[PDB]
Amino acid sequence: QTKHFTLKSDVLFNFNKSTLKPEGQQALDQLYSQLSNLDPKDGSVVVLGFTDRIGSDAYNQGLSEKRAQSVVDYLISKGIPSDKISARGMGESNPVTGNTCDNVKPRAALIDCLAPDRRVEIEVKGV
Amino acid sequence: QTKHFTLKSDVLFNFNKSTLKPEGQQALDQLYSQLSNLDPKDGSVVVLGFTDRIGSDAYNQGLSEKRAQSVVDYLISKGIPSDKISARGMGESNPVTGNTCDNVKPRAALIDCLAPDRRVEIEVKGVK
């Protein structure tokens, strides 16, 4: 059995930062039950960080990876074994919004429209 | 005679980049006849780039400069002599909004509130 989780980066992290906000800690707490029912042998967890097509929530590079790694770190401290979990920074790839926001021009409104693309996804194999 | 022009950085550039956008070229095209009719002996152009207060001082300064050079480089190609036009990046200093946005959240609302600070200012000296 495979499970999929999506968290909002706007809730998890401050702008340009990868330190988990309290609300982000809580959202990982609330999912940790089901996020940890792993097969001892072949259970694995992959944390994938994404931003939007203009990278609106960062001005420094590497933040989608930093954020995924930051989520891994937290989850390991909750009790996922470190050899069972890994982080990847997917940047702007695989946008959820598709072409929805192509014609949105103001910076504020474009940020809003692109919110669904600013997320961390978690794939759990073997539950 | 001195003249002052202000362009919206949001129109001229993409977020966190300094490549002059088409609509930025076009906005420059439209002011051109107002900033090219210069005196050969006293006429000068200065292009100032400003950012909002979000992020690093030094970061915003650098971004600021590149944006100003992009505007200058383009204006040079429309026909302004290189020795009469100049670029100066100003970072987050001299904000138009003052403290108006100090407590604004979340980020999109703040970005919207800080818009007037994200600008390119152009000073034209000695216009005929």
Ordered domains of chain B (ranges, CATH): 1-128 (3.30.1330.60)
CB contact under 8 A, B15 and A54: yes
User: Which residues in chain A have Cβ-Cβ distances shorter than 8 Å to B115?
Assistant: 107-108
In the beta sheet, which residues pair with residue B38?
B127
Length of chain A: 127
Are B36 and B81 in contact by the 8 Å Cβ rule? The answer is: no
- This structure was determined by X-ray
Per DSSP (E only), the strands in A10-118 are 44-50, 85-91
Q: How many CA atoms lie within 13 A of A102 on its CB side?
A: 3
Contacts of B112 in chain A (CB under 8 A): 106-108
DSSP-derived pairing of the beta strands A44-50 and B3-8 = unpaired
Contacts by residues A77-83 (CB-CB < 8 Å, ≥ 24 positions apart): A78/A28, A78/A29, A78/A32, A78/A36, A79/A32, A79/A36, A80/A35, A80/A36, A80/A38, A80/A45
CA-based nearest distance B15→chain A, Å: 7
Neighbours of B26 (CB within 10 A): 11
